[PDB]
């Protein structure tokens, strides 16, 4: 399908950029994850990027690996993420979908296979945290055949090359990463990153989304102003899933403020 | 784009996550750099000789093979400075850190023998150290922990997962991954992404060099077989490398079998885990069949590691190396039986390979064979543990 690239041409006409939450699926639990992906819609999520739970995500600080600990108390497997994203497709058949995957979970019972039922229950992109451009082949070829846009990181350090294979490479959209090390609210990023945003932009690579970091709605609006396409933000997200995990209503509640402020920021 | 082939096969590859690949890229350039250098490999050759005591012996073990026609001898890096084989290749490492301008080291250790060794280095070369060790294997291998601190290093108590040197590692990358313009992960086996797992062999690679002039010279031949332990790979690699051209002679790396390979409980995924991918490199993994890496068990923290480097994926794939499993009991008993007949108390790690020597003897007693095991470290850190498992025995 076509969901990011109608995205950002809808976002454009309405000169504005995206917000787009991840979460851990079946964190706190199936049921409660899919009233929590529900209200990200609602309160104005552009897209999602969702987590399905690994044992080791070496990418991931401890607000998300707590977020994977969680859903495995629950019982939380692969298949049953698989079933979860075919009822969110279900409700929501225009939101675009990305997964945040390890290589493993993707290796596991072939590649092929992995994309081929990413397409069936209506995936759109698919990002692999510990697989760089140098081993990505089957990966991106796997993705491309089923339809899945294969997501590449731009990290700070990109040099030419590396912007050249990202742009040629890449669909749906340009992973701008804010800074070195892994996912977390308490370390924001440093560098300026118009210089590569603008490259990315001469190669015709996929709208960029920065992430890593983005915590405030100030940040979504700096990332605009950049020139990015939108920003992602997990552990921010994250963290008010975990302090609120006795009280499910004031935890909805938070999360739609919370989503509709970032949301808000993306507008100008 | 890289300088050497980072795959055995299909084993090994860079499976980091995009942000480390200049860290991964630099680390290379700078080891092809360095191996061309002769400063280098004298400074290396200086620290090795004259700081960790390299030649280590190569014991004649003749009261253990009493009665049968086995010649066995031990390799005896349980002498080097650190006391474990572990010393070797953190000395090149840390060289190499140096040359890249890095001030800091991150290391990971279960047996604490990485972390010591890595400590000791930084603390002569002038680096800021700090380990990461599972809060199990604290424990367990106390004696570490105390030797690592007293020479300036920071050590890390990791309580997540299994509390085990997989969790040790976890961290260890995770920092690297934030901190590599001035930290150098000098990972402590043969194992994680290209470059490390051709680094350290090479750095390893003189335990093999020295065992081969050295049987040559006492027995006018080559060994029948070379038998080590495997947890990530170093020391059995080391020992491995320069025999692997000399098709007569036998690799045998010894995985731990745990409680026995039925129970699960185990770190034997080279035998009976499944190829994967997981800290940086495609290779055999403990895994559930939903792709989850499992946790691995051995009484020995060195050994407690659910996947294994990919060079010897690769040697076994093609029958170059043959690769067998100790449980916990059977290395105790080679513990036990090194102690009282060759006074010698020798790392859990490094029992297991010996238990499998010693049933290769006792299996076929008349079989004429010459065996060389890499006793790749002393015991003194597990003296405690040994103690309360046999009074709990009422031994
Ligand atoms: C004497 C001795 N003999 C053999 C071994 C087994 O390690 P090998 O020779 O590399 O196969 C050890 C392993 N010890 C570790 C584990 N080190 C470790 C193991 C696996 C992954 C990362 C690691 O740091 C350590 O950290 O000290 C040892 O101390
Ligand atoms: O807001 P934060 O700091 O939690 O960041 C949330 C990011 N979640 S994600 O799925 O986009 C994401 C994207 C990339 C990751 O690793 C990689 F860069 F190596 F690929 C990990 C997570
Ligand atoms: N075989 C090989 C050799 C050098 C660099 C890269 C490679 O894949
Ligand atoms: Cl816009
Ligand atoms: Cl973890
Ligand atoms: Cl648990
Ligand atoms: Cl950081
Ligand atoms: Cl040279
Ligand atoms: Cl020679
Ligand atoms: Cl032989
Ligand atoms: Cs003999
Ligand atoms: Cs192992």
């Given at each position: 399908?076509?969901?990011?690239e109608?995205?950002?041409?809808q976002?454009?006409?309405?000169?504005?950029?995206?917000?787009?939450?991840?979460?851990?699926?079946?964190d706190?639990?199936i049921?409660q994850?899919?009233?929590?992906?529900d209200?990200?819609?609602?309160?104005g999520?552009?897209?999602?990027?969702?987590?399905?739970?690994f044992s080791?995500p070496l990418?991931?600080?401890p607000?998300?690996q707590?977020?994977?600990?969680?859903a495995?108390?629950?019982?939380?497997?692969?298949?049953?993420?698989?079933?979860?994203?075919?009822?969110?497709?279900?409700?929501?058949?225009?939101?675009?979908?990305?997964?945040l995957?390890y290589?493993?979970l993707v290796?596991?019972?072939?590649?092929?296979?992995?994309?081929?039922?990413?397409?069936?229950?209506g995936?759109?992109?698919?990002?692999?945290?510990?697989?760089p451009v140098?081993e990505?082949?089957?990966?991106?070829?796997?993705?491309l055949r089923?339809?899945?846009?294969?997501?590449?990181?731009?990290?700070?350090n990109?040099?030419?090359?590396?912007?050249?294979?990202?742009?040629?490479?890449?669909?749906?959209?340009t992973?701008?990463?804010?800074?070195?090390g892994?996912t977390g609210?308490?370390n924001r990023?440093?560098?300026?990153?118009?210089?590569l945003?603008?490259?990315?932009?001469?190669?015709?690579?996929?709208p960029a989304?920065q992430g890593?970091?983005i915590?405030?709605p100030?940040?979504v609006?700096?990332?605009?102003?950049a020139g990015?396409?939108?920003?992602?933000?997990?552990?921010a997200?994250?963290?008010?899933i975990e302090?609120?995990?006795?009280?499910?209503?004031?935890?909805?509640?938070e999360?739609?403020?919370?989503?509709?402020?970032?949301?808000?920021?993306?507008?100008? | 784009?890289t300088?050497?082939?980072?795959?055995f096969?299909?084993?090994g590859?860079?499976?980091?996550?995009?942000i480390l690949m200049?860290?991964?890229?630099?680390?290379e350039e700078?080891?092809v750099?360095?191996?061309?250098?002769?400063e280098?490999?004298?400074?290396?050759?200086?620290?090795?000789?004259?700081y960790?005591?390299?030649?280590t012996?190569l014991?004649?073990?003749?009261?253990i093979?009493?009665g049968t026609?086995?010649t066995?001898?031990?390799?005896?890096?349980?002498?080097?400075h650190?006391g474990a084989?572990?010393?070797?290749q953190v000395?090149?490492?840390?060289?190499?850190?140096?040359?890249?301008?890095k001030s800091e080291?991150?290391?990971?250790?279960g047996?604490?023998?990485?972390?010591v060794?890595?400590?000791?280095?930084?603390a002569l070369?002038?680096?800021?150290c700090?380990?990461?060790m599972?809060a199990?294997?604290?424990?367990?291998?106390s004696?570490?922990?105390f030797?690592?601190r007293?020479?300036?290093?920071?050590?890390?108590?990791?309580?997540?997962?299994?509390?085990?040197?997989?969790?040790?590692?976890?961290?260890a990358l995770?920092?690297?991954?934030?901190?590599?313009?001035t930290?150098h992960?000098?990972?402590?086996?043969?194992?994680?992404p290209?470059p490390?797992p051709?680094?350290?062999?090479?750095?390893?690679?003189?335990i093999?060099?020295?065992?081969?002039?050295?049987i040559?010279?006492?027995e006018?031949?080559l060994?029948?077989?070379?038998?080590?332990?495997?947890?990530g790979?170093?020391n059995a690699?080391?020992?491995?490398?320069?025999?692997?051209?000399?098709?007569s002679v036998?690799?045998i790396g010894?995985?731990?079998?745990?409680?026995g390979?039925?129970?699960?409980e185990?770190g034997a995924?080279?035998?009976?885990g499944?190829?994967?991918?997981?800290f940086?490199?495609?290779?055999?993994?403990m895994?559930?069949?939903?792709?989850?890496i499992?946790?691995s068990?051995s009484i020995?923290?060195?050994?407690?590691?659910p996947?294994v480097?990919?060079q010897?994926?690769?040697?076994?794939?093609?029958?170059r190396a043959?690769y067998?499993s100790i449980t916990d009991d059977?290395?105790?008993?080679?513990?036990?039986?090194?102690?009282?007949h060759?006074?010698?108390?020798?790392?859990?790690?490094?029992?297991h390979?010996?238990?499998?020597?010693l049933?290769?003897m006792?299996?076929?007693?008349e079989?004429?064979?010459?065996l060389?095991?890499?006793?790749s470290?002393?015991?003194?850190?597990?003296?405690?543990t040994?103690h309360?498992?046999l009074?709990?025995?009422?031994?």
């Open positions: 399908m076509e969901r990011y109608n995205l950002f041409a976002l454009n006409d309405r000169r504005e950029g995206a917000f787009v939450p991840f979460v851990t699926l079946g706190p639990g049921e994850s899919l009233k929590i992906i209200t990200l819609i609602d309160a999520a552009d897209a999602l990027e969702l987590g399905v739970p080791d990418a991931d600080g607000t998300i707590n977020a994977n600990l969680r495995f108390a629950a019982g939380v497997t692969p298949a049953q993420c698989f079933e979860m994203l075919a009822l969110i497709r279900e409700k929501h058949p225009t939101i675009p979908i990305g997964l995957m290589a493993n290796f596991n019972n072939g590649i092929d296979a992995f994309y081929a039922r990413c397409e069936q229950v995936v759109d992109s698919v990002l692999v945290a510990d697989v140098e990505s082949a089957p990966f991106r070829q796997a993705a089923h339809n899945i846009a294969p997501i590449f990181i731009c990290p700070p990109a040099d030419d090359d590396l912007l050249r294979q990202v742009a040629s490479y890449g669909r749906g959209y992973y701008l990463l804010s800074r070195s892994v609210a308490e990023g440093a560098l300026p990153l118009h210089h945003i603008e490259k990315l932009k001469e190669y015709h690579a996929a989304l890593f970091g915590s405030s100030e940040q609006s700096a990332a605009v102003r990015a396409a939108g920003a992602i933000s997990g552990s997200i994250v963290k008010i302090k609120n995990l006795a009280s499910p209503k004031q935890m909805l509640a999360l739609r403020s919370f989503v509709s402020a970032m949301k808000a920021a993306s507008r100008a | 784009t300088l050497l082939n980072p795959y096969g299909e084993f590859g860079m499976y980091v996550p995009q200049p860290a991964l890229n630099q680390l700078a080891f750099s360095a191996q061309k250098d002769p280098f490999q004298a400074q290396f050759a200086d620290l090795l000789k004259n960790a005591g390299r030649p012996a014991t004649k073990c003749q009261n093979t009493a026609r086995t066995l001898y031990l390799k005896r890096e349980d002498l080097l650190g084989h572990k010393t070797n000395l090149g490492q840390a060289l190499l850190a140096k040359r890249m301008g080291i991150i290391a990971e250790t047996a604490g023998a990485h972390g060794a890595s400590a000791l280095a930084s070369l002038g680096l800021k700090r380990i990461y599972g199990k294997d604290v424990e367990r291998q004696p570490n922990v030797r690592m007293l020479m300036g290093a920071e050590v890390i108590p990791v309580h997540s997962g299994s509390a085990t040197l997989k969790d040790a590692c976890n961290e995770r920092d690297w991954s934030g901190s590599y313009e930290a992960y000098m990972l402590g086996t043969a194992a994680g290209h490390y051709t680094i350290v062999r090479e750095f390893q690679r003189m093999g060099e020295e065992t081969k002039a050295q040559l010279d006492k006018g031949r060994p029948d077989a070379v038998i080590a332990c495997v947890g790979g170093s690699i080391g020992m491995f490398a320069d025999f692997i051209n000399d098709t036998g690799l010894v995985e731990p079998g745990g409680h390979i039925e129970t699960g185990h995924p080279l035998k009976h499944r190829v994967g991918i997981y940086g490199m495609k290779a055999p993994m895994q559930t069949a939903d792709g989850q499992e946790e068990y020995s923290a060195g050994l407690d590691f996947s480097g990919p010897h994926a690769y040697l076994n794939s093609i029958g043959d067998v059977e290395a105790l008993e080679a513990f036990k039986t090194l102690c009282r060759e006074g010698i108390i020798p790392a859990l790690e490094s029992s390979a010996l238990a499998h020597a049933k290769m006792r299996e076929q007693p079989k004429e064979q010459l060389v095991v890499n006793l470290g002393r015991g003194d850190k597990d003296i405690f040994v309360d498992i009074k709990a025995r009422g031994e």
